[PDB]
Design a protein around this motif. Structure first.
Motif, short mmCIF file in Angstrom:
data_model
loop_
_atom_site.label_atom_id
_atom_site.label_comp_id
_atom_site.label_asym_id
_atom_site.label_seq_id
_atom_site.Cartn_x
_atom_site.Cartn_y
_atom_site.Cartn_z
N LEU A 109 0.80 -1.14 0.06
CA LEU A 109 0.00 -0.17 -0.08
C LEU A 109 0.96 1.15 -0.20
N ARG A 110 0.86 2.04 -1.06
CA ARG A 110 1.73 3.34 -1.19
C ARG A 110 0.48 4.57 -0.67
N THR A 111 1.23 5.67 -1.00
CA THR A 111 0.38 6.75 -0.41
C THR A 111 -0.35 7.43 -1.63
N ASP A 112 -1.30 8.00 -1.32
CA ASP A 112 -2.17 8.82 -2.34
C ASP A 112 -3.05 7.83 -3.43
N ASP A 113 -3.54 6.82 -2.76
CA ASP A 113 -4.37 5.72 -3.47
C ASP A 113 -5.54 5.61 -2.55
N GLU A 114 -6.70 5.34 -3.49
CA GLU A 114 -8.07 4.86 -2.98
C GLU A 114 -8.07 3.50 -2.61
N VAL A 115 -8.70 3.20 -1.32
CA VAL A 115 -8.68 2.21 -0.57
C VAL A 115 -10.13 2.02 0.02
N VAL A 116 -10.58 0.78 0.27
CA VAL A 116 -11.94 0.71 0.98
C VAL A 116 -11.62 0.18 2.36
N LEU A 117 -12.35 0.44 3.51
CA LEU A 117 -12.21 0.04 4.78
C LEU A 117 -13.47 -1.21 4.89
N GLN A 118 -13.10 -2.31 4.54
CA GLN A 118 -14.05 -3.33 4.80
C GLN A 118 -13.94 -4.08 5.86
N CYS A 119 -15.08 -4.91 6.22
CA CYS A 119 -14.90 -5.62 7.64
C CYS A 119 -16.18 -6.55 7.51
N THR A 120 -15.99 -7.65 8.30
CA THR A 120 -16.94 -8.76 8.39
C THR A 120 -17.78 -8.57 9.53
N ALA A 121 -19.02 -9.02 9.31
CA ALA A 121 -19.86 -8.87 10.49
C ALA A 121 -20.95 -10.23 10.58
N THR A 122 -21.09 -10.80 11.69
CA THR A 122 -21.78 -12.37 11.76
C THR A 122 -23.25 -11.94 12.61
N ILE A 123 -24.26 -11.83 11.89
CA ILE A 123 -25.63 -11.60 12.21
C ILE A 123 -26.62 -12.38 11.84
N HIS A 124 -27.42 -12.87 12.52
CA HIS A 124 -28.54 -14.15 12.49
C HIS A 124 -27.62 -15.39 11.98
N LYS A 125 -26.58 -15.51 12.74
CA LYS A 125 -25.55 -16.60 12.16
C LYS A 125 -25.34 -16.53 10.85
N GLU A 126 -25.28 -15.40 10.23
CA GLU A 126 -24.98 -15.05 8.89
C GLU A 126 -23.82 -13.98 8.42
N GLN A 127 -23.17 -14.24 7.51
CA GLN A 127 -21.72 -13.62 7.44
C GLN A 127 -22.22 -12.44 6.31
N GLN A 128 -21.73 -11.35 6.66
CA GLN A 128 -22.01 -9.92 5.61
C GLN A 128 -20.66 -9.18 5.69
N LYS A 129 -20.35 -8.66 4.68
CA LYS A 129 -18.99 -7.66 4.27
C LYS A 129 -19.64 -6.47 4.19
#
Lengths: 39, 46, 352
Positions: C4-24
């Protein structure tokens, strides 16, 4: 110092002031002797 | 003091359940509950 | 393997488990009108497309904590664990920071995160920490690595506080694995080439006919229709179409021929879909299926290539130009092609 301010803010967020004054205001009973294993 | 505060805030279960957490309200209710437990002998060790 | 360099577009993604179901989920923010941040389901994109334009963030600068403290007292650098990064919103232009307010009364120890205009003060920068045992402090970050964001002043993790109906991110003391997904690495994108995730306009080479919709002179039933116009409408705001690439990783790559993408109208917020019972229309994201909204660009009229490429890991190669490029739109299901008609009756044809 700034980290001192941060620690004080964390302590204040943990323990509010109204809680503190309400806990201070209990007016424990003062007695015929009593037991010292209470409040 | 700094590292102790860091550890205590990273591990929230070190505080009382009736003071910290999504259950008990705070120190007021916690200590009033404590006083009433002290007052009623039905919640002790016979 | 890309650092990862400087001056580049990125996304802050994460995982979440709700209703015993995975979602990003993204870390997203509207910015204009609402300072606080929220979540955006980057997963489950076949039926509802996420808003990548507010999902993505840019790394403005990357300095260590001590260099930051010296800046407080007073090219394209690489990203290392332990640095104090600066995240700027791509669209809103503001900078991601830690607000000193607390909206959620449940977690009485955390703050709220949001966007702010100025970068001054240590209440806007964030530090990256390793989340796994395989990785330690001081090594280079690569794509797909899970990290932990900590505030500089608040000294609180970018926690994903789970709630009954308030899926809001805070600065709490519980670590949350925030994976990073690149969008545009800032490569040699020449002035004039087509980049994914952009908004543009389509004109004709000999007619200057722009693909527009009726203005606010009528209601949404009229504005949903799609047609061609000319004249001053080329500089209007109701004639802008944004290309949303399906993949969330490297969505700001170079658009290659034959790949699917969604057509969005940034003026109303609806997506250009095609129903076989009529012509194309505009439907909101709630029902914008990929099999009805994903279109592609071809260089000719034939069907020589349909099931060829699925993904390419990288910025891509410069193929389509803005200056001289003759593309043909093609649907993934029906494969139809654009044609201009004369449906306008001769009653008021010259003026309308």
């Amino acid at each position: 110092k700034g980290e001192a301010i941060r620690i004080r803010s964390i302590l204040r967020s943990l323990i509010p002031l109204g809680d503190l004054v309400g806990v201070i205001s209990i007016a424990f009973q003062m007695p015929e002797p009593d037991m010292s294993a209470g409040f | 003091a700094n590292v102790v505060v860091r550890l205590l805030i990273r591990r929230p279960e070190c505080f009382g359940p009736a003071l910290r957490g999504e259950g008990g309200n705070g120190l007021l209710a916690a200590m009033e509950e404590a006083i009433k437990i002290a007052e009623d002998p039905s919640r002790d060790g016979p | 393997i890309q650092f990862l360099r400087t001056d580049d577009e990125v996304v802050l993604q994460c995982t979440a488990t709700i209703h015993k179901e995975q979602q990003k989920l993204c870390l997203a923010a509207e910015g204009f009108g609402n300072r606080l941040c929220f979540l955006e389901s980057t997963s489950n994109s076949k039926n509802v497309p996420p808003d990548l334009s507010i999902c993505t963030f840019v790394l403005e600068q990357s300095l260590s904590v001590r260099a930051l403290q010296e800046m407080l007292a007073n090219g394209h650098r690489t990203l290392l664990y332990g640095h104090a990064i600066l995240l700027r919103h791509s669209y809103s232009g503001m900078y991601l920071c830690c607000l000193s307010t607390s909206r959620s009364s449940t977690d009485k120890l955390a703050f709220d995160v949001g966007l702010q205009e100025d970068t001054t003060g240590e209440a806007c920068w964030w530090t990256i920490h390793p989340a796994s045992k395989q990785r330690s402090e001081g090594e280079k970050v690569r794509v797909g690595d899970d990290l932990i964001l900590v505030s500089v002043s608040s000294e609180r993790y970018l926690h994903l506080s789970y709630g009954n109906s308030s899926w809001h991110v805070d600065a709490a003391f519980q670590q949350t694995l925030w994976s990073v997904a690149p969008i545009s690495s800032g490569s040699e994108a020449a002035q004039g080439y087509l980049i994914g995730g952009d908004v543009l306009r389509l004109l004709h080479g000999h007619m200057d006919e722009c693909l527009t919709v009726p203005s606010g002179e009528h209601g949404e039933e009229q504005r949903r229709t799609v047609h061609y116009e000319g004249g001053a409408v080329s500089v209007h705001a109701r004639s802008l179409w944004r290309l949303e690439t399906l993949r969330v990783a490297w969505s700001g790559s170079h658009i290659r021929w034959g790949q699917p993408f969604r057509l969005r109208h940034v003026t109303t917020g609806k997506y250009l879909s095609l129903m076989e019972d009529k012509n194309l229309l505009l439907m909101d994201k709630e029902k914008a299926d990929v099999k009805s909204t994903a279109f592609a660009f071809r260089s000719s009229k034939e069907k020589l290539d349909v099931g060829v490429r699925k993904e390419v890991d990288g910025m891509g190669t410069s193929e389509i130009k803005y200056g001289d490029s003759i593309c043909y739109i093609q649907h993934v299901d029906t494969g139809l092609w654009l044609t201009y008609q004369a449906v306008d009756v001769k009653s008021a044809r010259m003026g309308s």
